[PDB]
Design a protein around this nucleic acid. Structure first.
Ligand SMILES: [Mg+2]
Ligand SMILES: [Mg+2]
Ligand SMILES: [Mg+2]
Ligand SMILES: [Mg+2]
Ligand SMILES: [Mg+2]
Ligand SMILES: [Mg+2]
Ligand SMILES: [Mg+2]
Ligand SMILES: [Mg+2]
Ligand SMILES: [Mg+2]
Ligand SMILES: [Mg+2]
Ligand SMILES: [Mg+2]
Ligand SMILES: [Mg+2]
Ligand SMILES: [Mg+2]
Ligand SMILES: [Mg+2]
Ligand SMILES: [Mg+2]
Ligand SMILES: [Mg+2]
Ligand SMILES: [Mg+2]
Ligand SMILES: [Mg+2]
Ligand SMILES: [Mg+2]
Ligand SMILES: [Mg+2]
Ligand SMILES: [Mg+2]
Ligand SMILES: [Mg+2]
Ligand SMILES: [Mg+2]
Ligand SMILES: [Mg+2]
Ligand SMILES: [Mg+2]
Ligand SMILES: [Mg+2]
Lengths: 65, 117, 52, 151
RNA sequence: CUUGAGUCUCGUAGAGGGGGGUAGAAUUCCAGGUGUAGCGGUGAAAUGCGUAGAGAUCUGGAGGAAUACCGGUGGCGAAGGCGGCCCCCUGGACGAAGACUGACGCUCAGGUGCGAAAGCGUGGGGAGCAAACAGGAUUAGAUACCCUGGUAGUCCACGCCGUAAACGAUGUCGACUUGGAGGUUGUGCCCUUGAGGCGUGGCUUCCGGAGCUAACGCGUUAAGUCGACCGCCUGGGGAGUACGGCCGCAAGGUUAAAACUCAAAUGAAUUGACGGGGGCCCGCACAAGCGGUGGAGCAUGUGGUUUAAUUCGAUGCAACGCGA
């Protein structure tokens, strides 16, 4: 839980799909913080990165399209 | 009266009625039957039993196409969502897989107003 | 592969993805004041539950 | 039976054959407390099946029993305020009870100018699975299969 | 003079605001690809679309509006309010360690600005939703709730309106007064550092002490202990109405009485009763069984009717083979 504080990484990258995929369900929906354990400061940056990656077609919005 | 060699089942469901439609992967309808065309109307129209009847009715109505392998896409939160799945698995329908295709708007349009009762 | 416990695998993704609840929720228009009132109700309940 | 479930009262085994099954049978067709009046019909309608209908009277009793026993019965219970004809499974002893209770009701409509003759005729006909008694079991099954939608 | 207030340097978080782009999901419409009889709707129905091909299904396009989850007990804003992503202009808050100005402060009648929604004017735009309205129902009625439609409106630009249960029903600024558990946000230190454990702030949620309160409750974010200033109250109806003034295109807003009328109106809490509020738990209450009553003939009681009299009483359970 709160992985972005153990590593201490200041910024989350929208291009790091290997990390972003661990926070996205098969449906393509962001996982809440009450489930993953991420901090709020980092959950907000996660949501921003996920949306920015979904704009660049690096991630699905829904599981269908 | 003609083959397509495959099929795709599309279970449209509504609280009022359930519709079953066998179609080719290209989306061209081969056969269809509704739980309201099974002789069930009004309240009788909306029940897992009526959808179970409509599933087999559509199965037989398409049976002359020799469909065997089918993909099931189910839609709508009404009852008979799985009842229809089971009742079409009948007649040796080789189910590849299922998928929920229910339309989920991303806060797009205004729904009607809440009913009072 | 069996068809029975292949259909229970459907009733797990279907439910845990919620969509059944979402169709009911988006069925009728909830006024924003009712949204916030219900959010506050759930908040106070599932909060003051885990004290007493 | 709201606090402690007493269950069915225990019964003595049949005097002639030492069998509880047949004892419950005589208890289930005894009218007005007439025990001997009923068992004198029972033992005759079993002797007649012993000599001609089958080889053994006591075993013929069972071969007619399981030939009329039902399995799934609709016990109408409203789950959440709607009339649901939910189908439930019968227990073994209640299964035997229902079976004999239906066979006596079948023998009643037989006529045939006797009571032993009726019981013999219908117990046989049910053992062959072709009796007025078996139709009620398959009608229970029909009504169970109609109402599958409420499981 | 430097402690109040303010400035500078370095950072941090944020749905703060204005502007411009943009993406995906969904709705609707259009054109078609296959295809057949229903679709849709409800307590149940019907109106309503459909055989000129509906709905269902696939492809391609048009368009308007709103941004699933992330999302919170979250954050920001003076308040109203603010939610996809990106850019552009932009306001405030906070922190760290210093330097600088030297009371430059607080409050504020009139004044000026901002101010949800509905509404108004002009010009657009219009997918969904939906006052009025149209039809279908329900009903004793049904100018309603229910259903199929549907116009202004909702959207945009520029003006006006200035009102809300605009609420924390709690004016602003400052000081002081036991604690506990949280969230969010900076930051000093120290572990060997990753985690981790100590210090100090900003905002915020919930308990609770003293005290306060009519009580409920409030409780270091006071409704406690005090100070500065402003607004406001003076029984209930009449009435936030009339008249006048100001303001508005208009709807109306604002300021704001009296005659008359009543002996109360009201706040909180208490004990019951009641609820088409809950939770529970028992009874041949139901379920599971067996046998009846209701039909027939008679016996018996009652009502009614009749009679000179048909003696009086008992009348839902709890009167009617009852006093007898
Ligand atoms: Mg509707
Ligand atoms: Mg912003
Ligand atoms: Mg067409
Ligand atoms: Mg704030
Ligand atoms: Mg003023
Ligand atoms: Mg408006
Ligand atoms: Mg207008
Ligand atoms: Mg216009
Ligand atoms: Mg309407
Ligand atoms: Mg409509
Ligand atoms: Mg008008
Ligand atoms: Mg408000
Ligand atoms: Mg006020
Ligand atoms: Mg103060
Ligand atoms: Mg408290
Ligand atoms: Mg004070
Ligand atoms: Mg007070
Ligand atoms: Mg007065
Ligand atoms: Mg006025
Ligand atoms: Mg005036
Ligand atoms: Mg009171
Ligand atoms: Mg009973
Ligand atoms: Mg009678
Ligand atoms: Mg009678
Ligand atoms: Mg009389
Ligand atoms: Mg009398």
């Amino acid at each position: 839980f709160c992985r972005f504080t153990a590593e201490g990484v200041q910024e989350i990258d929208y291009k790091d799909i290997a990390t972003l995929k661990n926070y996205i369900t098969e449906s393509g929906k962001i996982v809440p913080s009450r489930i993953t354990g991420t901090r709020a400061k980092y959950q907000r940056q996660l949501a921003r990165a996920i949306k920015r990656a979904r704009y660049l077609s690096l991630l699905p919005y829904t599981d269908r399209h | 009266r003609k083959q397509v060699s495959d099929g795709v089942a599309h279970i449209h469901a509504s609280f009022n009625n359930t519709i079953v439609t066998i179609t080719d992967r290209q989306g061209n309808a081969l056969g269809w039957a509704t739980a309201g065309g099974s002789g069930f109307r009004g309240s009788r129209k909306s029940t897992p039993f009526a959808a179970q009847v409509a599933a087999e009715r559509c199965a037989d109505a398409v049976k002359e196409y020799g469909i065997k392998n089918l993909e099931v896409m189910v839609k709508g939160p009404g009852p008979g969502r799985e009842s229809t799945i089971r009742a079409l698995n009948a007649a040796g329908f080789r189910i590849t897989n299922i998928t929920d295709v229910t339309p989920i708007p991303h806060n797009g349009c205004r729904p009607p107003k809440k009913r009072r009762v | 592969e069996p068809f029975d416990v292949a259909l229970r695998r459907f009733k797990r993704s279907c439910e845990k993805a919620g969509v059944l609840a979402e169709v009911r929720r988006r069925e009728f228009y909830e006024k924003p004041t009712t949204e916030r009132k219900r959010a506050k109700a759930s908040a106070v309940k599932r909060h003051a539950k885990k004290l007493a | 039976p709201r606090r402690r479930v007493i269950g069915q009262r225990k019964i003595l085994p049949d005097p002639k054959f030492g069998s509880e099954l047949l004892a419950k049978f005589v208890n289930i067709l005894m009218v007005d407390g007439k025990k001997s009046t009923a068992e004198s019909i029972v033992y005759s309608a079993l002797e007649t099946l012993a000599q001609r209908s089958g080889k053994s009277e006591l075993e013929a009793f069972e071969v007619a029993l399981e030939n009329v026993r039902p399995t799934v019965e609709v016990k109408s219970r409203r789950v959440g305020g709607s009339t649901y004809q939910v189908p439930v499974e019968v227990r073994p002893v209640r299964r035997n009870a229902l079976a004999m209770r239906w066979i006596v009701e079948a023998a009643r409509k037989r006529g045939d100018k006797s009571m032993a003759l009726r019981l013999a005729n219908e117990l046989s006909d049910a053992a062959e699975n072709k009796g007025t008694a078996v139709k009620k079991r398959e009608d229970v099954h029909r009504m169970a299969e109609a109402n599958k939608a409420f499981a």
